[PDB]
Design an enzyme around this catalytic site. Sequence first.
Site, PDB file in Angstrom:
ATOM      1  CD  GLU A 251      13.563  -8.707 -25.574  1.00 18.38           C
ATOM      2  OE1 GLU A 251      14.230  -9.501 -24.874  1.00 18.38           O
ATOM      3  OE2 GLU A 251      12.577  -8.985 -26.853  1.00 18.38           O
TER       4      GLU A 251
ATOM      5  CG  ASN B  76      -8.367  -6.217  -4.079  1.00 17.62           C
ATOM      6  OD1 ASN B  76      -8.513  -4.945  -4.256  1.00 17.62           O
ATOM      7  ND2 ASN B  76      -8.465  -7.199  -3.026  1.00 17.62           N
TER       8      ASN B  76
ATOM      9  CB  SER C 199      -0.963  -0.186   0.896  1.00 18.62           C
ATOM     10  OG  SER C 199      -1.530   1.328   1.331  1.00 18.62           O
TER      11      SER C 199
HETATM   12  N1  LIG Z   1      -7.121  -1.764  -4.008  1.00 16.93           N
HETATM   13  C1  LIG Z   1      -7.264  -2.137  -2.890  1.00 16.93           C
HETATM   14  N2  LIG Z   1      -6.533  -0.903  -1.753  1.00 16.93           N
HETATM   15  C2  LIG Z   1      -6.258  -1.673  -0.649  1.00 16.93           C
HETATM   16  C3  LIG Z   1      -6.915  -3.294  -0.296  1.00 16.93           C
HETATM   17  N3  LIG Z   1      -7.078  -2.737   1.462  1.00 16.93           N
HETATM   18  C4  LIG Z   1      -6.578  -1.719   1.463  1.00 16.93           C
HETATM   19  N4  LIG Z   1      -6.291  -1.050   0.338  1.00 16.93           N
HETATM   20  C5  LIG Z   1      -5.976   0.226   0.457  1.00 16.93           C
HETATM   21  O1  LIG Z   1      -4.743   0.181   1.410  1.00 16.93           O
HETATM   22  C6  LIG Z   1      -4.976   2.147   1.906  1.00 16.93           C
HETATM   23  C7  LIG Z   1      -4.511   1.579   3.253  1.00 16.93           C
HETATM   24  O2  LIG Z   1      -3.325   1.190   4.164  1.00 16.93           O
HETATM   25  P1  LIG Z   1      -3.582  -0.363   4.233  1.00 16.93           P
HETATM   26  O3  LIG Z   1      -3.249  -1.242   3.348  1.00 16.93           O
HETATM   27  O4  LIG Z   1      -4.952  -0.923   3.996  1.00 16.93           O
HETATM   28  O5  LIG Z   1      -3.326  -0.794   5.356  1.00 16.93           O
HETATM   29  P2  LIG Z   1      -1.724  -1.263   6.628  1.00 16.93           P
HETATM   30  O6  LIG Z   1      -1.117  -0.434   7.300  1.00 16.93           O
HETATM   31  O7  LIG Z   1      -0.700  -2.376   4.800  1.00 16.93           O
HETATM   32  O8  LIG Z   1      -2.567  -2.796   7.095  1.00 16.93           O
HETATM   33  P3  LIG Z   1      -3.113  -2.710   8.380  1.00 16.93           P
HETATM   34  O9  LIG Z   1      -1.611  -3.177   8.871  1.00 16.93           O
HETATM   35  O10 LIG Z   1      -3.822  -3.639   8.412  1.00 16.93           O
HETATM   36  O11 LIG Z   1      -3.038  -1.237   9.175  1.00 16.93           O
HETATM   37  C8  LIG Z   1      -6.058   2.719   1.692  1.00 16.93           C
HETATM   38  O12 LIG Z   1      -5.617   3.464   0.140  1.00 16.93           O
HETATM   39  C9  LIG Z   1      -6.411   1.329   0.987  1.00 16.93           C
HETATM   40  O13 LIG Z   1      -7.572   2.117  -0.068  1.00 16.93           O
HETATM   41  C10 LIG Z   1      -6.988  -3.859  -1.845  1.00 16.93           C
HETATM   42  O14 LIG Z   1      -7.451  -4.909  -0.806  1.00 16.93           O
HETATM   43  N5  LIG Z   1      -7.302  -3.481  -2.241  1.00 16.93           N
END
Ligand SMILES: Nc1nc2c(ncn2[C@@H]2O[C@H](COP(=O)(O)OP(=O)(O)OP(=O)(O)O)[C@@H](O)[C@H]2O)c(=O)[nH]1
Lengths: 430, 428, 429, 430, 123
Positions: D246, D220, D132
């Site tokens: 490539e 996803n 993310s």
């Molecule tokens: N496309 C998409 N975006 C996601 C998904 N899950 C979270 N997000 C995005 O991820 C962002 C928030 O970050 P997270 O990945 O949820 O948080 P994290 O810190 O990595 O994980 P946690 O430990 O659960 O807090 C936001 O922009 C969300 O919209 C997913 O499965 N698909």
Amino acid sequence: REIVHIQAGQCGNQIGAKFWEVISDEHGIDPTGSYHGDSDLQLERINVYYNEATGNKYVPRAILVDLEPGTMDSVRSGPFGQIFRPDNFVFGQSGAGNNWAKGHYTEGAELVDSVLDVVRKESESCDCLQGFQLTHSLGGGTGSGMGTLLISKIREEYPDRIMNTFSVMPSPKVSDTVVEPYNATLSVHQLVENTDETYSIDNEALYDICFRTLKLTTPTYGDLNHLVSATMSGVTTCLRFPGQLNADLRKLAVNMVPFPRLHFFMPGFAPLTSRGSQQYRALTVPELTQQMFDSKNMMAACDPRHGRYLTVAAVFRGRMSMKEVDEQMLNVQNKNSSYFVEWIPNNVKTAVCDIPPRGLKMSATFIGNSTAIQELFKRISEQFTAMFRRKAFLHWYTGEGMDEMEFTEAESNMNDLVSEYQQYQDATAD
Amino acid sequence: EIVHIQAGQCGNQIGAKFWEVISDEHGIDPTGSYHGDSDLQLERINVYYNEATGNKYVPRAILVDLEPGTMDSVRSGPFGQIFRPDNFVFGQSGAGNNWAKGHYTEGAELVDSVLDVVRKESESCDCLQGFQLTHSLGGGTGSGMGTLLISKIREEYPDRIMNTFSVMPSPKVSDTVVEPYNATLSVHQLVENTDETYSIDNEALYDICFRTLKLTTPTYGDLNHLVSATMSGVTTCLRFPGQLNADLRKLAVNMVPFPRLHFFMPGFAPLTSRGSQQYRALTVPELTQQMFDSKNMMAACDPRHGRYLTVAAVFRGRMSMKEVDEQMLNVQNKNSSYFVEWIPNNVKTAVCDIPPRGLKMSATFIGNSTAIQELFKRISEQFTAMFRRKAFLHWYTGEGMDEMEFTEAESNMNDLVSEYQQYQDATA
Amino acid sequence: RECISIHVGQAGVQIGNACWELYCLEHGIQPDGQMPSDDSFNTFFSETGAGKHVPRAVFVDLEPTVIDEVRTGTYRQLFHPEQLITGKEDAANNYARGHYTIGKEIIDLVLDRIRKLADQCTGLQGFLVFHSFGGGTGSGFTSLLMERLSVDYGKKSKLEFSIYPAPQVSTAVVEPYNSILTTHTTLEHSDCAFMVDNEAIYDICRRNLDIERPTYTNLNRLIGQIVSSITASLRFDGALNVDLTEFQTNLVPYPRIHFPLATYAPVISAEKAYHEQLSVAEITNACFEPANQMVKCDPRHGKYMACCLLYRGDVVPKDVNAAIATIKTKRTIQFVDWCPTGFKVGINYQPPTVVPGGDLAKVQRAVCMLSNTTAIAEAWARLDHKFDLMYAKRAFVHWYVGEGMEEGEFSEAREDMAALEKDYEEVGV
Amino acid sequence: MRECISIHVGQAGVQIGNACWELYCLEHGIQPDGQMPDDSFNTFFSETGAGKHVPRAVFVDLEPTVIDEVRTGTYRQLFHPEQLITGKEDAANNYARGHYTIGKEIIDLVLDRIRKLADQCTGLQGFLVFHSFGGGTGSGFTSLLMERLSVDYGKKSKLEFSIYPAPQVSTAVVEPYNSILTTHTTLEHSDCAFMVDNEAIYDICRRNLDIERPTYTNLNRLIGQIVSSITASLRFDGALNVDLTEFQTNLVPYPRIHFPLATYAPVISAEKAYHEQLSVAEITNACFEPANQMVKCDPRHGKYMACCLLYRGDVVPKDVNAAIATIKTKRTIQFVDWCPTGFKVGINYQPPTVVPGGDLAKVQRAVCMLSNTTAIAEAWARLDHKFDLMYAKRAFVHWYVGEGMEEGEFSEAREDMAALEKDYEEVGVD
Amino acid sequence: IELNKATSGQSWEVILKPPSFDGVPEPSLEEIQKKLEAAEERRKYQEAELLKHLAEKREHEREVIQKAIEENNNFIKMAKEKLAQKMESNKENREAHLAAMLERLQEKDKHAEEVRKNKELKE
Ligand SMILES: Nc1nc2c(ncn2[C@@H]2O[C@H](COP(=O)(O)OP(=O)(O)OP(=O)(O)O)[C@@H](O)[C@H]2O)c(=O)[nH]1
Ligand SMILES: CC[C@H](C)[C@@H]([C@@H](CC(=O)N1CCC[C@H]1[C@H](OC)[C@@H](C)C(=O)N[C@@H](Cc1ccccc1)C(=O)O)OC)N(C)C(=O)[C@@H](NC(=O)[C@]1(C)CCCN1)C(C)C
Ligand SMILES: Nc1nc2c(ncn2[C@@H]2O[C@H](COP(=O)(O)OP(=O)(O)OP(=O)(O)O)[C@@H](O)[C@H]2O)c(=O)[nH]1
Ligand SMILES: COc1cc2c(c(OC)c1OC)-c1ccc(OC)c(=O)cc1[C@@H](NC(C)=O)CC2
Ligand SMILES: Nc1nc2c(ncn2[C@@H]2O[C@H](COP(=O)(O)OP(=O)(O)O)[C@@H](O)[C@H]2O)c(=O)[nH]1
Ligand SMILES: Nc1nc2c(ncn2[C@@H]2O[C@H](COP(=O)(O)OP(=O)(O)O)[C@@H](O)[C@H]2O)c(=O)[nH]1
Ligand SMILES: [Mg+2]
Ligand SMILES: [Mg+2]
């Protein structure tokens, strides 16, 4: 993943007990402490506020603290009373007597170490302790004094844990204890310094709601306490019940708090209800959305339109159209754009729980960081500065140890917070 | 005797096409056994093929690649069985269109290992002529390792002659942005290390396939079908007995007047289609003037832009040297401005009375024309585009190199164009 | 009386194959060596203990193929394995390679086979050197050989049989370089040099012999016939040209001009209907028309200094002098101030032999001519300008300097090749 | 040989990976046990004695919830309990926690499973980091790990799949901080990064899959389709073409300029019926409409430094060349002077396999166009602005600072962006 | 006129107009080898000089593959060394915050004592 609860003084225990009554029912638990609910989502995040016991029974994770058996006994001989672990009840016979110095310094401190012994126990039996939760009267002795004494001592032991409070701000409209603005101002001093977030339950709003709206001529505490708990289930909704998020005191804190001193929230709830009255005509989505950004529905007697929102978190409960919600949520912010800080992009965030509160098909909670909350602090400073000017009732404190400058110390610290709130209210992007 | 190395994706596919066309001309059936009609084939079969005694035949071919892919294509290929298994020398980490990978880091790791095969394969020979390297000039294995291998070989066999069938890149065929970098770097190494180099412009092969052969979707098989023709075409003199009676060094002595000016412009007549239809033969005049005309050159230049220093021409098929010689004297008299007057009898003909596969006549051409500087400006220009802004250099500087090597490699090719010019203008 | 015939490089080697072919034919020697039933034939044949007559000839090449084609031919039995000396890689059209490179390597061993061919001699006159001009071997090594042969066999003769290059014949672009550097080095050494302009032999095998694209074999079938006509008096018990030092006197008056022009009649084909054979008056007039001349250079415009009319077979001296009187009548035919206007005529009564199953015709009568003319400068000036063009721009030079030569060697050779042309002026006044 | 490990960094990273990995099992007809009823797929999976094909991947998260969903989920046996790493204490949407405080307490264990996966690698090509942009874990932890592999695995290929924040799809006020913080720290340690602006993913579902309220899965399942199209050229050796790395050579002109733009096509919902089907020439032009882009930007205004067409299914050069022919006249595809006007085209055999009970319908012929346009710096601009706004006031900053972080790290991380922003300016100069 | 007669041959001079002018005029083995040994010296040296320029190239490659080997290792130093600084500055920093907050609290716990003292001083 685990919240330790502490209730302090009269109000503290009064509001705490109701919260516990509300959330046990919400989770399907009987006064004895045995589960009975149909949905297994009730048992989902139960680990937060509850303890797993023998006979698969549950016990609220809460420390009952006061310097008088009074309310302490009223609780035991109350509805849920037996559900609480009696070993947690830390009750002296002193009586702080609506005196901050008796609670924070003298009569409180003696009991403080006994209290901690229990907190250190409840913290120990924890997969992951999230933070602490305090319910307390800002005008009394034990609640505001010993309550903030407890915070500071807990804050020493666990600086890494979230400190959350439910601080009920006094009102001249609800009490004749003349010293109340003294105990109020001194407690705010502590709060601005040692709590991550504080939900400002103001006794002025609580009354005017119960009076002007609920139309109950002579509102009882039961009438007020009910609204307190309505917002308390609301605020703690996603902390307890499952959903999309995830569900952390810390995540909320980090998102809701832009500046560390400023962490006093303006709790709001819709629909407003008279204690134990069967509901009939349900609410539409725009009613809940409109009736939630209404000064009329705010637990703290301040006008959201008088200030500017820094952060807002709106929790809607019970099955409803999110498009209707998102449609409305965006109407409100796009129309009332003047009351939202441009320098905090995307300041409003909405959560929806399918599980609603008992007797409601649809509810909606509001948590807000509006600068407007200064109107609360201002009100108290004037109330305090009125008496302090004339050194009124002061000898009650001096003779309890307490120094004179400590009052002027808390008064001007409160005056800083006010200016601090206005500073960002004014502040623009350009 | 001759040793034939094939480097890279291009060089291996190119090489296996030569090795199949010449094995049809020599009766070496995919398995490795002579079955041909006349023993005229067998006479000069020792030049390319060895004996398993047997009496099976093995090509004097070493296979090089920095990744397996193409080696396996040959293995899976029809004429692949004929190759000595102990001759496939290949890595796993692809060199990926980086001259610096093939020439430095990755190449070095397989060089020594390859060189052993050439050491060995050179032992089997009574007296070797020299070496033949088939490769791409825009890649990495072919482009970089091939030039690395050349420098290594030159050091080991200084007296032996370095002959290459070097395929010039083009933007019409290959989207790899980096190509003018490898090309230049590799050109620089040829200018200084090989004795004769056959310039195969892909621009021109794609243009032939397109405009001339009317092929809407030119595939490598079509572009490579043209190359095998021009290979077996220029190697008619080495494989075939007649009044020639020549070698790699005799060719080099006679073709190359000045050292560095040793890049050749291959030509072919008739430009046949891969498959259909073989009907209707050519006359001698048709076969001569076609071959001399720019539309029949495997290199993209205009013979009429420069002046030929020396010309070579192998006419195949049953004809008459009267007819042939009558047209050569006609051409040189007609287009007298484009042949350097200061190199008496500057055009050599050769007639073999054996036609290639299918077609009953052929006319392979080689011309040491000053006009080739056009092919070099073409690259030098393409280079600079990227170079002035230092675009895509990171891939090379990462490999261990310095901008200096690029500055030098261009400056050296700019001096070649400067040299090719000197003679284009010169007169007695 | 003995004679070593050396053949350096492909041309001379291939030419030697056609020579000893006619020699063994004219003397009745079988491709094995025996000759069943004057003895002067022995001047070229060294008889072994097994009664066979092995030629006094050493064959030389820097690459195997050609000498390996001898150990293939029916005449493989004719020579010892020592006399056919072969290298592995030839002086690839490079004089400097033939001389300084592969030369230096093979010299000693080549001279040894000569020594041991000469370690059989009651009176070795000299050597009959056969070669090309534009070949890497037939210029680089031959010139290196004459060099050491001149030291190792001082006061003994040298009779150069050189093949002048031609474009209509398989020629190379470097040929004019080799041709000059050789002549420069094979000048102070050669005592007599017989040029064979490949240009003339070419069309002679066509205009008179009807073969449009003549093979090296057909071209040589003719060369051997002219070569044997020169050696006829040496191989037999004849009067004129009984020794090697006879031509050197009878033809070479001024030393550097040791290039006599040859002429041959009757150039005749086989696949044509038979008729009346040519007479003495027929061939003598044919001997004076350049339509049968060996080297293409205008005799009509160029001063003489010698002449010898070498006849063969069914001839008689009266008719010879009757055919001599015919030419002095209308043709004045020029001669230098310091020279007598007359020729030394010779008749070897032996029959003119032709190859059985050949393109040539079995004629009872024949002739040849050895004539030193200033016109033979017209042959050099051709080759001199070809050298002149390339060397100006230094075209191909790098190959030579790469083989150990010096850049000066081209100017040195061209200075001498110009000096010789001023000597054709200083003489043809 | 040609092996590559995929590393998933919490919530976004994990959830995305599952959509990827489920699609991979379908692509190479694998069953959720590792068993399966070309060998090029072994670049991602690995066969054991029992014939079990375990993926060359690592699922990491600072808290348990998301990884627990995998540990009980429909593919529980497809992995190792070791290759599925978790904490307890979340990153609290804070980079400073993800990177330092919490992150440090796992990194060492994490890098070890990477090293154990690295051992079974005959010839490692590089790594794929699904994270993310605004998540505490997705941001902080990723950069720590990316910095650590640039140490441990030195100059090895570190590829990324970044999830660009969109307000429509969740978000949290701080996200732009976490975004710019990680973008900065990763820059040196990255090789080539594929951004995925959640709004453009949202927009697509809404518009083509006709989903008014797109679920994470809905997005996803779509994202995995685009990602798989990128990695198709690795798990498939199709003679046709199929050749990543490539592409990367044309795609990455300079090292900081490593963000290709994905323009997937055709996104069609299982509802169309008699729409069958699009020609090569249709889907080619589809890649040129900004409505199909993975990141919302405008390359009609923007200059070009690469264009790469990755076809898959029923593709024949004839029409691809005919397609490229027409487009080459459309005077909106303007390249730089130093850059050639060519298109690197790769074609696959295996057409896009569609998820059982999905939103999308089985397409015969799919594409994805990767391109190096200066128009991408709009995403940076979008993010940098929101950053500036909150940073101006130093809003929420104290949470980062509170976890160690110097006030300067934020500015450093911003100037670096400003440089990259200016680098896309400079490169676009003709 | 006459010259000679033989077994299988005969010869004779045949004059026409004699000369108008009565007059006519108007190698070492050591120095062969001396030239050949100077020639080989040449051929052997330029081919030996070539071998120097090839050996010169072999060193460039020896240095280039080396630059690349250092270029990655010097980079791993920077990466490992930066990470080491960052985790330390942070360990230092986060700890100063935590330590200073408990110091503030401890001082505020000090006040409490002098207050229960000011109560007993009053008593
Ligand atoms: N496309 C998409 N975006 C996601 C998904 N899950 C979270 N997000 C995005 O991820 C962002 C928030 O970050 P997270 O990945 O949820 O948080 P994290 O810190 O990595 O994980 P946690 O430990 O659960 O807090 C936001 O922009 C969300 O919209 C997913 O499965 N698909
Ligand atoms: C201009 C040259 C191109 C890159 C070719 C070609 C590739 C090729 O020949 N390829 C790449 C795999 C193999 C081969 C062909 O298509 C299956 C077969 C028939 C062949 O000729 N096989 C070879 C085998 C082979 C040759 C070389 C290397 C490896 C294998 C043979 O017959 O012997 O596609 C046909 N091409 C027209 C194309 O249309 C390609 N397009 C492009 O690259 C364009 C549009 C044209 C150049 C600038 N950009 C692409 C859409 C495939
Ligand atoms: N007439 C005639 N000329 C020949 C013959 N072979 C070659 N030549 C000529 O010889 C010249 C070339 O010299 P070569 O001796 O053949 O070449 P080389 O380099 O010395 O020897 P090799 O390389 O071993 O063949 C050219 O002028 C050819 O025309 C032959 O048999 N007859
Ligand atoms: C190994 O193959 C060949 C080798 C050579 C020649 C050649 O062209 C006919 C070849 O065929 C391609 C050759 C080339 C060019 C010449 O001048 C430009 C020359 O004078 C002379 C030649 C060749 N000599 C002859 C008489 O053709 C010798 C070298
Ligand atoms: N809403 C509410 N306010 C209360 C309650 N009990 C006391 N208060 C308020 O609390 C303040 C005095 O604090 P109190 O709880 O009596 O004192 P303590 O026992 O020393 O904590 C006044 O402003 C009262 O209005 C209660 O149950 N509900
Ligand atoms: N004509 C032709 N060009 C080819 C062939 N294969 C690749 N190319 C060219 O080769 C160059 C790329 O080098 P290549 O040999 O494929 O890669 P390497 O493995 O690193 O040598 C480009 O200029 C391509 O156009 C082939 O078989 N024939
Ligand atoms: Mg030779
Ligand atoms: Mg997080």
